[PDB]
């Protein structure tokens, strides 16, 4: 049978997602203040110590 | 090939083909298409030797009790209705009192056919079909309908005296819950699994006693609708619950003298001090009247779909819905005779009347038996 099954340890093949896309920010002018990130969009930024890529062991 | 496409259930038909007092027919005169595929309480009756017999296809006879020749004949095939045609279709048995053949129908009519010609000397409607044969006494025709209504129709001219709902079944089940008059009170069972004596002369409750289970949350008999109709020999009401569960209880209070809440009892008669009863195995068993003390039982009848055990020619007679009449020893369960006179299965009981044994199956309509 040609139907098979094998895959080992890594984060997913988007290793672009180890790089955390350069977000071109938006500061509102005065008197023209707009709302902010809401919904899912909340990033507690902690690239403080932690593994990306293959180094992120999953088991 | 063609046989391999179907599916089955089980019965054990005709053990002990017996002819020790070799049964024959008294006559055979078949009425027509009789007792049918409905829940039916129509059964043959034999009166005056003028055999007032009926089918469900309209036709009501008076056969003659030697050969079954028509003394009169009519048809209750009414020519109009909300089915566009109304046959007899009888939810009650043949009650012949006076010049009235009272029969309750699934046309909701309780007729009273004049026994000289068969013409309807009165008919009066009941609430839908009946659970009951017409019980004619006290100026009343006692019908307990499928709607649980103990009704009283004027047995001479037709007039509703009191239609009294007492014990409608739990899921509108069927089965006989016929109102029997005992000690002045109409004593009704009920395929709610209960029994009740009720003052017949207005429909006033003497007592209501739940005996045991009916269909609905305790799923029981649709192989054989158990008659909760009480055979009240004396002020111990003897009855069954709708799950077959036999009871003996007071007629004025419903206080239980004894009860078989083990009853698989299909048919049941009080034969002296020995309650002869057809169980769900279609065995005949003689329990006492002061207990379920088996005075005798039967293994010669087994999975037969029997009728009620009656007596004729010195033997316990019971036909079955395999159409085999049987003559059981009145003691311990042995056949003496066995008769297939049927072209059918005998749904109705062997009417041991006029010195004969009158029957009428669903299409095996009126034969009559001597041995």
């Amino acid at each position: 049978c040609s139907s098979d099954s094998r895959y080992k340890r890594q984060v997913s093949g988007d290793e672009a997602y180890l790089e955390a896309a350069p977000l071109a920010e938006l500061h509102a002018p005065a008197g023209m203040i707009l709302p902010v990130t809401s919904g899912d969009y909340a990033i507690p930024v902690t690239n403080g110590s932690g593994a990306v890529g293959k180094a992120l062991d999953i088991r | 090939l063609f046989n391999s496409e179907e599916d089955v259930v089980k019965m054990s038909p005709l053990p002990t083909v017996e002819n020790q007092f070799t049964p024959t027919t008294a006559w055979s005169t078949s009425v027509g298409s009789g007792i049918g595929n409905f829940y039916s309480n129509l059964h043959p009756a034999l009166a005056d030797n003028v055999v007032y017999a009926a089918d469900r296809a309209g036709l009501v006879k008076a056969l003659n009790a030697d050969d079954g020749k028509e003394i009169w004949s009519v048809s209750l095939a009414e020519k109009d209705g909300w089915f566009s045609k109304e046959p007899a279709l009888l939810s009650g048995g043949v009650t012949v009192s006076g010049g009235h053949v009272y029969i309750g129908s699934e046309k909701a009519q309780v007729y009273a056919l004049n026994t000289s010609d068969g013409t309807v000397a009165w008919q009066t409607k009941v609430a839908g079909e009946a659970l009951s044969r017409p019980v004619v006494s006290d100026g009343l025709v006692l019908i307990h309908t499928s709607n649980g209504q103990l009704q009283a129709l004027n047995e001479a001219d037709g007039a509703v005296k009191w239609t009294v709902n007492l014990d409608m079944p739990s899921l509108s089940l069927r089965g006989e819950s016929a109102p029997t008059t005992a000690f002045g009170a109409a004593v009704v069972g009920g395929d709610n699994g209960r029994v009740s004596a009720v003052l017949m002369e207005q429909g006033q409750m003497i007592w209501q006693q739940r005996i045991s289970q009916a269909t609905g949350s305790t799923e029981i008999d649709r192989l054989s609708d158990v008659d909760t109709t009480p055979v009240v020999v004396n002020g111990v009401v003897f009855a069954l619950a709708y799950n077959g569960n036999l009871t003996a209880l007071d007629l004025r209070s419903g206080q239980i003298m004894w009860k078989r809440e083990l009853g698989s009892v299909n048919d049941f008669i009080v034969d002296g001090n020995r309650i002869y009863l057809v169980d769900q195995n279609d065995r005949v068993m003689a329990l006492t009247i002061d207990g379920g003390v088996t005075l005798w039982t039967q293994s010669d009848l087994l999975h037969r779909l029997l009728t009620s055990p009656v007596l004729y020619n010195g033997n316990l007679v019971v036909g079955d819905s395999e159409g085999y009449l049987h003559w059981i020893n009145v003691e311990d369960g042995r056949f003496v005779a066995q008769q297939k006179v049927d072209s059918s299965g005998f749904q109705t009981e062997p009417v041991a009347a006029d010195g004969k044994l009158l029957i009428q199956a669903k299409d095996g309509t009126v034969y009559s038996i001597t041995r």
Binding site: - | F38, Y39, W82, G128, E129, S146, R174, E219
Partner: protein, 783 residues
């Protein structure tokens, strides 16, 4: 007593301390004999300990346990068409599953719970016995005997208390017609108590329209025929009397549309009461207020049933919402195609009041999309405003992949085969891919076909079709009609409306021929070509590089991308020639698809499939015979071989084909069939008139896992192909097809089968009227 050690004799899901904690006397806690019995019940309160024998070694507890846990399997036997997982689910209703606490008490709870289920199956003669089969160290298999004898059947509904109609006409107007009075014929019956539940309101809605506001079903007594099979029912009803709708007095918030709401409820006072019309007229107001933006309109009719004149009086209580409910919309199920493809398939826009059917027409446009399996939405009210609803259009996308095949028995003969595959917009790319081709000795055909249907914003259907037919019809060599046809076909569609879309394209038809067939209609168009090629010989070559201009337009109002049921579609497509062509002609056609539902359940819809075509020269030429039209085979008149219906050419009295297969491939040639043979196959008419009259038909005996796109489809197929360029002295003693009085006829059923390789159609048709040179293939195999 105070326990120094608790003896644990087998637990298997409850831990050692977790058993010990469920013991109210723990190791170190004092043992009481009441605590021992408390140790029994509270380890019985573990829900995993079948038996618990709490003893003690003086005080040192000896808790001998039997175990309920993991039921390692559950076996079913007698598990007939009522499925064993449903038999597991009433067992799951008995609290039992695989990997579970087995208390061995719930055995009959599985059984009588299933026997009560067996009652509500439709049977009553159906029993079940559960069997415990132990597996390693506590584990159990639950074997299950199922003793199912026979099922119950509804026989006849005795509706007593019926004083307006008869019972049987109700049963006729539930489902029935007559049975062979030398008139119509009907079917069979079985039991289910919900069919009883359904027809009683079909009883009531038969009363609710003919009057009868005080119609009421009084009671109901099912006959327990003592068989567990005979389901007669004694139903008490009461018609009450006929009733009239005697006036509408609509009130409440009619939202400033009061005449309109009255216009929907314009009734006849004294007209026999139609309560079914009344609730409809409520819905008339609801869509009226809905299309007026009020997405949540209360409409509450109230017939003040006036029994004194046997009438009713319609109070109506209407209350609309606010207009701008469509604040914004959402799109889900667009993980394979983008939002803006699905977003542009709508007529409801945000920043608007609600057009109630703008959601639906776009959903019908999404039904007319075809890249889907489902079309649904979530029109959710965002709370906070009466101008606030999110319409979350969640749909399910396309099932892709489709194949077509023909066989030439390759690798057991010459390497000969017919290919072809369709990708059905693979992965929702907006690239529908369908590619075919074939390599025989006769031909080596190449073809390409793909489009982005929306490649630019105005619906640019970027479709470039390619072809290279290295076709020779090789018998041994280039002797019988070589044609190396090659080139391209780039075509574009543009929407002129929301249901109207145009088409235009161009064709490059570069053909390379040799030794063409020695026959009239071949040479006759080539006589119109300005050639006069050899009648009596296949020695004649042809190079045409035709520069053709294609065009078209479509109508599209017809439901579904892969199982439509109602509407109409017109599909114009034609072609013409331009300068630079090697031949000057046109060829115009049209396709139609109009669905007329006879059944309003749309299991029986008229599906008329007919084909038209005409083409001739643009002056001084002809339309080619290879562009002349045909029919037969898989065509709209099936039951035939391919190219049967049409004009029939005549071979000139012919010699070798520059090589004649000896008494083979007969073209009036030198070896056999000589002296003006007639080309018996349909060589083609430059005009066409053919039709196929198909129907939706449900499959009432098929598992409907796949019948959502399976259509059994009967037909009566008929038509003609005929050449207005046909000669009649060349075809004097031969088939003349200058007239469309060549109406063939066939009839039969098409069997459309939804595979994972798409719909697969198959036909059987017996042609009972044919014309000249028709051939018959009743066993018709199609894709």
């Amino acid at each position: 007593f105070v326990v120094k050690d608790i003896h644990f004799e087998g637990l298997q899901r409850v831990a050692v301390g977790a058993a010990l904690l469920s013991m109210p006397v723990r190791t170190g806690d004092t043992v009481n004999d009441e605590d021992i019995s408390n140790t029994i019940r509270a380890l019985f309160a573990t829900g995993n300990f079948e038996d618990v024998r709490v003893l003690r070694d003086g005080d040192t507890l000896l808790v001998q346990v039997k175990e309920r846990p993991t039921i390692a399997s559950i076996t079913f036997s007698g598990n007939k068409s009522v499925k064993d997982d449903m038999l597991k689910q009433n067992l799951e209703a008995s609290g039992v599953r695989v990997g579970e606490s087995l208390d061995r008490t719930t055995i009959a709870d599985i059984e009588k719970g299933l026997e009560d289920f067996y009652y509500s199956v439709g049977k009553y003669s159906a029993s079940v016995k559960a069997v415990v089969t132990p597996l390693p160290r506590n584990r159990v298999d639950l074997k299950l005997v199922f003793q199912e004898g026979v099922s119950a059947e509804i026989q006849q509904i005795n509706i007593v208390g019926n004083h307006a109609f008869t019972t049987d006409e109700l049963i006729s107007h539930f489902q029935l017609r007559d049975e062979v009075p030398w008139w119509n014929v009907v079917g069979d019956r079985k039991y289910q108590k919900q069919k009883l539940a359904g027809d009683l309101e079909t009883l009531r809605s038969y009363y609710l329209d003919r009057g009868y506001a005080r119609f009421n079903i009084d009671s109901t007594q099912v006959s327990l025929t003592p068989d567990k099979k005979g389901i007669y029912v004694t139903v008490n009803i009461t018609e009450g009397d006929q009733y009239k709708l005697s006036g509408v007095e609509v009130s409440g918030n009619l939202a400033g549309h009061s005449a309109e709401i009255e216009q929907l409820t314009k009734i006849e006072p004294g007209e026999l009461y139609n309560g079914t019309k009344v609730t409809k007229m409520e819905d008339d107001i609801k869509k009226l207020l809905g299309r007026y933006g009020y997405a949540y309109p209360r409409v509450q009719s109230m017939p003040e049933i006036n029994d004194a004149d046997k009438t009713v009086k319609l109070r109506v209580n209407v209350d609309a919402g606010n207009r701008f409910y469509v604040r914004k919309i959402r799109f889900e199920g667009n993980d394979t195609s983008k939002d803006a493809v699905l977003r542009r398939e709508m007529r409801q826009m945000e920043g608007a009041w609600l057009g109630s059917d703008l959601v639906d027409q776009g959903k019908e446009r999404l039904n007319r999309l075809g890249f889907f399996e489902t079309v649904d939405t979530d029109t959710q009210r965002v709370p906070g405003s009466p101008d606030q609803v999110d319409v979350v259009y969640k749909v399910k996308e396309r099932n892709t992949g489709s194949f077509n095949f023909g066989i030439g028995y390759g690798t057991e003969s010459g390497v000969s085969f017919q290919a072809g595959v369709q990708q059905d917009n693979w992965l929702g790319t907006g690239y529908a891919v369908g590619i075919n081709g074939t390599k025989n000795d006769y031909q080596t055909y190449a073809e390409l076909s793909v489009t982005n249907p929306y490649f630019t914003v105005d619906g640019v259907s970027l479709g470039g079709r390619l072809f290279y037919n290295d076709f020779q019809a090789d018998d041994a060599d280039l002797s019988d009609y070589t044609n190396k046809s090659y080139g391209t076909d780039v075509t574009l569609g543009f929407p002129i409306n929301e249901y109207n879309s145009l088409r235009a394209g161009l064709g490059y038809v570069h053909n390379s021929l040799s030794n063409m067939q020695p026959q009239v209609a071949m040479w006759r168009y080539l006589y119109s070509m300005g050639e006069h090629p050899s009648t009596s010989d296949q020695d004649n070559s042809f190079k045409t590089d035709d520069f053709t201009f294609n065009y078209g337009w479509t109508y599209n109002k017809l439901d579904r991308g892969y199982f439509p049921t109602d509407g109409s579609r017109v599909n114009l497509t034609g072609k013409v020639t331009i300068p630079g062509s090697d031949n000057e002609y046109y060829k115009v056609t049209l396709d139609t698809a109009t669905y007329v539902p006879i059944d309003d359940d749309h299991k029986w819809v008229v599906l008329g499939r007919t084909r038209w075509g005409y083409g001739d020269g643009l002056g001084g030429k002809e339309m080619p015979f290879y562009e002349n039209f045909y029919a037969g085979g898989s065509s709209t008149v099936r039951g035939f071989q391919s190219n049967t219906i049409g004009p029939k050419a005549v071979y000139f009295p012919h010699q070798a084909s520059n090589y004649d297969p000896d008494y083979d491939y007969e073209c009036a040639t030198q070896d056999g069939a000589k002296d003006l043979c007639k080309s018996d196959d349909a060589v083609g008419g430059n005009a066409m008139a053919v039709a196929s009259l198909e129907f939706i038909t449900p499959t009432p005996f098929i598992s409907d896992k796949y019948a959502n796109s399976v259509r059994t489809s009967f037909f009566w197929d008929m038509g003609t192909v005929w050449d207005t360029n046909w000669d009649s002295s060349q075809y004097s003693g031969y088939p003349d097809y200058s007239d469309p009085s060549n109406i063939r006829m066939s009839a039969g059923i098409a069997l459309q089968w939804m595979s994972p390789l798409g719909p697969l159609v198959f036909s059987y048709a017996q042609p009972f009227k044919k014309y000249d040179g028709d051939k018959a293939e009743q066993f018709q195999f199609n894709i």
